[PDB]
């Protein structure tokens, strides 16, 4: 997770625990076709092909949002250290040149295998906004992101 | 009793999430928020046991999906008419009291109980009782606007939270009766700021740059900034008023208030001229008119009027 902001970028992150296995959690963050799985600002998402480096996905976003859609290439999944990386190429969003990094690691929560996930991100500061507005927003979705994350984990464990 | 009209549809977007409610005496409203225990004592008659009929008209514009809207549609007039009967009775054996501040806690303690079972913060009773559910009843990203208007013979009481909008043509000339909550608003930023959030400018002024409004039910991916307390007021009815419009933003982003009063007054006369729960044709014909107006106006929301005539 070392991401080089430029000048005109900034960059921050937000971590989650949950309380299920690495491979469970990883199962979910790996289908990069199906965002849906735990993201509940995605409505559609479609893809051709299978899941590899290069892979575009274009995703659908639910109401109430300032954008409709945007266009994502999977630069980095690796199955064995648990690493997915994105990057945003398109849309009608005004988050240009948007990059995250995930990560899955293990951890003991309460006596059981745990997980805590880390994402961090870099993007452009649009045209009238601040660095530390541009981060808000990001991490106002992400903390949402990796909430229903926890959540959809959590209750396959049963 | 009530004369109302009601036009909606999925417009030009791929997926309904409006929703709207019409229930004719769904209540009666007790007549001690409405006067004064001794004004009417002075005539011989109890305030505690006068019977008036009211009538319940309701616009939810969905964000996020549909479920809160058609939630708010199913729930609100019956928490509401509960509520009221409840009243009715604790002023049994209570005093004089603030009509205004009485209006504010029914409409808030209503839409706060709605919004309390969307997220789960409390039981709700499901299949008429034996039922119940703990777990919210959506995604923590679906919202939506509440603009409600109780209507009685006497006054119009009119509860409002989002950017759906009420608008009152009294005098051939239009009355806001609800001010819309863009998060942009200067006391709204100021209580979202005071609060530790931000109203950002990101394709309009946007509550953590995300939701286009400052109130709403559900939504509690973004309390405490986003909160579903309505602003409520009371109107004494007149003789001068002419109808009652409650729409959705898919009517007022092309149709200012001016314009849809003029149409809905001309639209319920032009059906009266032309011809000398269920809906009155005129008051019909004046929302089919408004819906269609704003699709030929390029709206590309969802789009739900409602329209009430005051006179006849
Ligand atoms: C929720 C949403 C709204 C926008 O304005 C932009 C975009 C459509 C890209 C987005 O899907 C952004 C999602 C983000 C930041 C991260 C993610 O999804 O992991
Ligand atoms: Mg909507
Ligand atoms: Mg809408």
Known sequence: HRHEPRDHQCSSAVAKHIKAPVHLVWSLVRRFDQPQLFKPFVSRCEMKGNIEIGSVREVNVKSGLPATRSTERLELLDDNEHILSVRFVGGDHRLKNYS?????????????????????????VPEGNTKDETCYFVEALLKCNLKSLAEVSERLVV | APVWGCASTRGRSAEMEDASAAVPRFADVPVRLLASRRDLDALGLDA?????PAHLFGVFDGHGGAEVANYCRERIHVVLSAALARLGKNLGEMGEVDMKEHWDDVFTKCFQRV?????GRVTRVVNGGGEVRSEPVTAENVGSTAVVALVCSSHVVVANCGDSRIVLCRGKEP???????????????ARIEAQ???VIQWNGYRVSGLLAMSRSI???????????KPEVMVVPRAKDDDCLILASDGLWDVVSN????????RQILLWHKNNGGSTDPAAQAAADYLMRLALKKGSEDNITVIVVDLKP
């Not at chain 1, 995250?100 to 870099?122: A, K, N, Q, W």
């Not at chain 2, 009355?175 to 930023?189: F, G, N, Q, T």
């Open chain 2, 258 to 265: 001016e314009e849809a009063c003029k149409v809905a007054r």
């Open chain 2, 175 to 189: 009355v806001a009766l609800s001010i819309d909550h863009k998060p942009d608003r200067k006391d709204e930023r």
């Open chain 1, 100 to 124: 995250s990094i995930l990560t899955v690691h293990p951890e003991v929560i309460d006596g059981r295998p745990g997980t805590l996930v880390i994402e961090s991100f870099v993007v452009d």
């Open chain 2, 48 to 52: 505690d046991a006068l019977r008036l």
């Open chain 2, 218 to 228: 559900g939504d509690r991916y973004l309390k405490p900034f986003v909160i579903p």
């Open chain 2, 196 to 198: 530790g959030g931000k």
């Open chain 2, 115 to 119: 919004d309390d079972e969307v997220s």
